[PDB]
Amino acid sequence: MRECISIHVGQAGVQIGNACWELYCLEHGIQPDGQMPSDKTIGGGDDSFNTFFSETGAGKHVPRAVFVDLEPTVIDEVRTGTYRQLFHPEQLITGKEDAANNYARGHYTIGKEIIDLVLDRIRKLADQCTGLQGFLVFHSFGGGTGSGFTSLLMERLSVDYGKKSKLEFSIYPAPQVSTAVVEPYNSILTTHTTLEHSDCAFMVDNEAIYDICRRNLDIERPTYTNLNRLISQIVSSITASLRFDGALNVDLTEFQTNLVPYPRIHFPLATYAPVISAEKAYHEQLSVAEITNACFEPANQMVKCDPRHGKYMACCLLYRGDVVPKDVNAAIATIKTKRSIQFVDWCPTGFKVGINYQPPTVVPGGDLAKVQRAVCMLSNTTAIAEAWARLDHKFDLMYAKRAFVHWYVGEGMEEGEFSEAREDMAALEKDYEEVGVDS
Amino acid sequence: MEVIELNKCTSGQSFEVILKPPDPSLEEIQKKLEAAEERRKYQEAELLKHLA
Amino acid sequence: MYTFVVRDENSSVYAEVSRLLLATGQWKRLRKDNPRFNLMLGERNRLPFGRLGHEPGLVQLVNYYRGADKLCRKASLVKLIKTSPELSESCTWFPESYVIYPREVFLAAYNRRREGREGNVWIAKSSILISSEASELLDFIDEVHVIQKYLEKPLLLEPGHRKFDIRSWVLVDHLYNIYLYREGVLRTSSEPYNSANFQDKTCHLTNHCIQKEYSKNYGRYEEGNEMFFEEFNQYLMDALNTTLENSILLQIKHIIRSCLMCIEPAISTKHLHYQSFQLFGFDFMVDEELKVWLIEVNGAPACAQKLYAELCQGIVDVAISSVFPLAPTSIFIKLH
Amino acid sequence: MREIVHIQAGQCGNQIGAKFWEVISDEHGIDPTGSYHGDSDLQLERINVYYNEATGNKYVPRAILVDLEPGTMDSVRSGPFGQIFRPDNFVFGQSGAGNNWAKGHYTEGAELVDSVLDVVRKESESCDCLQGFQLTHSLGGGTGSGMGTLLISKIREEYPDRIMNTFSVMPSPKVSDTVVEPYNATLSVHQLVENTDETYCIDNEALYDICFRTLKLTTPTYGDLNHLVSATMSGVTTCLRFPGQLNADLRKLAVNMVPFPRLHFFMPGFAPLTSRALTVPELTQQMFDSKNMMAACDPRHGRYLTVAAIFRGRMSMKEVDEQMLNVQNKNSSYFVEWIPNNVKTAVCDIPPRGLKMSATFIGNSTAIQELFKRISEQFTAMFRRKAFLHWYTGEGMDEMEFTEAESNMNDLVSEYQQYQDA
Ligand SMILES: Nc1nc2c(ncn2[C@@H]2O[C@H](COP(=O)(O)OP(=O)(O)OP(=O)(O)O)[C@@H](O)[C@H]2O)c(=O)[nH]1
Ligand SMILES: Nc1ncnc2c1ncn2[C@@H]1O[C@H](COP(=O)(O)OP(=O)(O)CP(=O)(O)O)[C@@H](O)[C@H]1O
Ligand SMILES: Nc1nc2c(ncn2[C@@H]2O[C@H](COP(=O)(O)OP(=O)(O)O)[C@@H](O)[C@H]2O)c(=O)[nH]1
Ligand SMILES: [Ca+2]
Ligand SMILES: [Ca+2]
Ligand SMILES: [Ca+2]
Ligand SMILES: [Cl-]
Ligand SMILES: [Mg+2]
Ligand SMILES: [Mg+2]
């Protein structure tokens, strides 16, 4: 058994961490007080769920998690919420004054003042690990803390834990729920600084989650709670292989091995189905073939884009519920005879499949309906570069006039960092073009 | 279209179906951070000089 | 009020479409880099499809199908026909064609014709040389191209003993309905066809530009080298005792349906975050047995001068006002 | 990012500040004795932004009252909420400033500014995490204009990393007390350009026009003008005073609103304009209407760099989003294309007093240059003949200072023009 440490940075990261750990407790039968009746080894053990929970002698199962925010109002909600008993104070780190949606303020001005405290609190969790495999880092692209402090933390984690894998869950900015005009600046800056330090990053475009909630959950104006419950379902689908028995994606290194043949092209596209409203009393249970077909419809993707006009480098199907391999293979055959699924020619045209028999868990009183089977497809497709193109275009539009640049220079950053990060993004888009498009 | 590496357990099973064959150092980081801090201090000193 | 942008200033069709949209009083043109549009009349090359459909509160529509280039490039079309099971190498309305880069398959079939005394004339073109000897074509290429069986027995209009090609305009809307404009056009040669001299490329190439320069009889039989469907149907009746519909138009509709339905799964915007339509120009040949052959598909076609008004009005009716409604006798035949 | 320190200087500053405190004390359920009597915890969740908590359950505004003559502050102390202010936070002299920026900035005000700063320091020292300061003042008089800008300079020297926010009333010949108001305002604008992060330009011309044309008030008083000012101030501080995601503190507001450091002068607006049921389309349409702007500028004469919209009341957030997207999409020419998604929208459930729904508008428009051009023309008309300068040279100022202030304000106008044309 090898431990994973989760790090939640900024508002988006912390609230998504709340949702994820609530869902984990429900999936593993851990009560809000940390007790887990089905765990018959008191005070220890090396079960799969111990990858994410440590155990006290009193029988409490404690998340291997650190929460970091530069202002205290969001983490105070963890301290006062349902699962407060789950966490010890040393896991919850707050400052007094946030990064004001400023990458430079998060990375330099304040980050330099809190980075050592954060690293010490992470070290304390690492010292409880017999074989730490790495970190899962949850953060927004757009916020000052989520971008700048995350980039700083990733650099320091590369220094202090060189041999350890680092995965990201990154919230891509969307104007319908965004709070800052400079979010494209922050996104490109943190992507440039983090690119060398992340082995695999799962981008979640708030636009996609928002529209999925509106369309499939019939929520007229989704809130962060709706978005985070959906995002936590997807995150749980991704980490279930680390948290349960199974042969596929069982350590962080396997994510990179299976999904990322080239280190820089490490942003898999996630697609999830089915998303069904709890309000909808009569509901037709979708078959394996139907939900597998839904994985290739952009309307179900975590990032809106068109894989038909890109190329695949890897594809994993993660089923939960009543699913058998024969039905999986039948569905794949049918879909292949009907869809534009083109792989790069130096890669096999194949699917790596895992099935967990436990159907997805949903939060009681939530918006998601309980379904008999669901699937999350993680495919590494060049089409995801459409999001980089969008972000870089907005960046270019603002930076041609140096709009808002003085806010970043004022925190000790140099203007050259903008153009350096943008050139790194241009090289990334060019890499995606080379791997994905024919002449 | 072949199925390979089928592993089964009590909680699920995995396999693979094929349809067709084919870092900066701590010192450098502290240096960056201190350079930014010094540029901040210089801008603030310039402001205080102007106000004086 | 609906909003649109114009990013191809060199398109006559969509210049007229922009004019019509403005003259309705319910469409307002923005600067070309304004993202808050309902409609994009986009550029021919590197249209930023990846940036469409990400504007909240805006239903966004573009006048091009991403991926339709597969149908509208010579080599791409050859490869698509040969490798698509829906079309297959056994396809009977596309001339034998091969993609050659600056081969062995081409020479193999060519040798079958050589030691078979058969008509062995081929044409080489790209995105032109007509020869009966393969070495000359292959040498011409090296100085990506397609080599294609040259139809040595074309249908010849009389009087004049002259060659022609047929241009059909086809509109595919956001629902992937296929509309064939009821008005086609025949681009005619004004010089008598000469099966003994492919050296002179004026009685062999029916292009309007080529005629209007190298043909000394340009404009003799019709204006300018354009015969429209009423006169061509009357000619077919008088001369060959058949109608245009029976002898040619059925095959034309079949071919259009075949190609567009073949590529539908790859370009359809049915469940996409933005929507597409596109106008296509299909170019057909007719041999002396009244068999129709597909020559090429144009992704950004022009129109016959006297048909611009009707066709562009039909565009704004079928493709644009269907998505953005304003406050029978359809000019299109719906193919299904 | 928690506590804000409030300062009100001069006659106009203290009158509009007293009305502001009355309004937001009602909104937060605080009675004139400092006791809370509301019915919703939303009223208390961020009460510490503007109020200290005192012995018992008393809430005392973090407010400092400054003037160079006692009259207006005696009237505040006798006003409805007069007893709510901390007695030690009244800092006044006796000489007055005689509508003279030089007296406010260099002589009379210089004699009082240190005790004002002492009170500022005492308030800041008991702040968990000071965000910065908001100042209410006029630019046409002497104390507000000159001594407020002096106070801003001193506070910037002592707190260089804190946000400076002002509510600045621009003089207008339509509602004028003296002919030297263009001098005082031009001298003040230079200081604000250098030493504030955000300035709400409240143009008395616009307030008069609204009271007369729209509210059908034949003879508008300063009370009637200050009704609009207090409603607008409550609107623009809603995101600071109530829980929310967008522009929830002064620095985030500045980062969202200020693309270039000098262009930080905001045009506020309010809907509905009052002295019985608005739909969201009506709220949006009116809030973008020039006749609802508190700066006498035609926005259709310039371009929006950034916009913040705040809707208050119980309404369909779906419909709010639809209507804001509608306004942007159908008038996109008036929003600069080189700042994508420059309109941000907040919704607060708690409406102001007397209304079921309202909307407050904060625009950083290049059309604000019309206000500064108007002030510059009125300045030059007197300055070219050196009229009324002796009031200022008698206080130690030299003409070169006026020439330089004129130059800088002309530069500000030229910068707005550059970005209007970009
Ligand atoms: N899906 C989702 N997105 C969120 C959530 N909270 C914030 N965001 C998004 O994240 C971006 C804002 O970044 P934040 O995480 O709020 O900022 P931060 O990390 O706290 O950094 P600072 O507040 O500037 O110190 C915007 O695009 C928001 O839409 C959340 O709970 N769920
Ligand atoms: N197998 C073939 N047999 C007989 N004629 C042929 C032929 N292939 C092409 N042609 C002739 O070539 C002429 C046009 O050539 P082509 O098909 O390349 O279009 P084009 O390149 O001139 C227009 P564009 O490329 O812009 O769409 C036609 O008039 C046609 O008669
Ligand atoms: N909206 C409003 N404007 C005022 C008020 N009092 C003065 N003004 C204006 O402010 C200018 C005079 O400033 P004033 O505050 O009286 O001088 P000070 O006391 O020395 O700062 C003139 O332009 C007045 O019109 C007021 O109560 N409300
Ligand atoms: Ca155990
Ligand atoms: Ca006065
Ligand atoms: Ca004295
Ligand atoms: Cl290590
Ligand atoms: Mg935050
Ligand atoms: Mg052609």
Author numbering:
A (entry chain A): 1 to 439
B (entry chain E): 6 to 27, 44 to 73
C (entry chain F): 1 to 102, 128 to 152, 160 to 175, 179 to 362, 371 to 379
D (entry chain B): 1 to 42, 45 to 277, 284 to 360, 369 to 438
Give the exact sentences the study uses for this entry:
Here, the benefit of using a wavelength of 2.7 over 1.9 Å is demonstrated for native-SAD phasing on a 266 kDa multiprotein-ligand tubulin complex (T2R-TTL) and is applied in the structure determination of an 86 kDa helicase Sen1 protein at beamline BL-1A of the KEK Photon Factory, Japan. In this work, performed at beamline BL-1A at the Photon Factory with two real-life targets T2R-TTL and Sen1, we have demonstrated that the increased anomalous signal at 2.7 Å (sulfur f′′ = 1.5 e−) over shorter wavelengths can be harnessed effectively as long as the crystal dimension in the beam path is smaller than 100 µm, and extra material around the crystal and air scattering are minimized. Both Sen1 and T2R-TTL can diffract to about 2.4 Å resolution, but only data up to 3 Å were collected and successfully used for phasing.
We used the tubulin complex T2R-TTL to assess the advantages of native SAD at 2.7 Å. A T2R-TTL needle-shaped crystal (500 × 70 × 50 µm) was mounted on an elliptical ActiLoop (Molecular Dimensions) with minimum surrounding solvent [Fig. 2(a)]. Native-SAD phasing was also possible at 1.9 Å but only by merging 21 datasets, which constituted more than double the dose used at 2.7 Å.
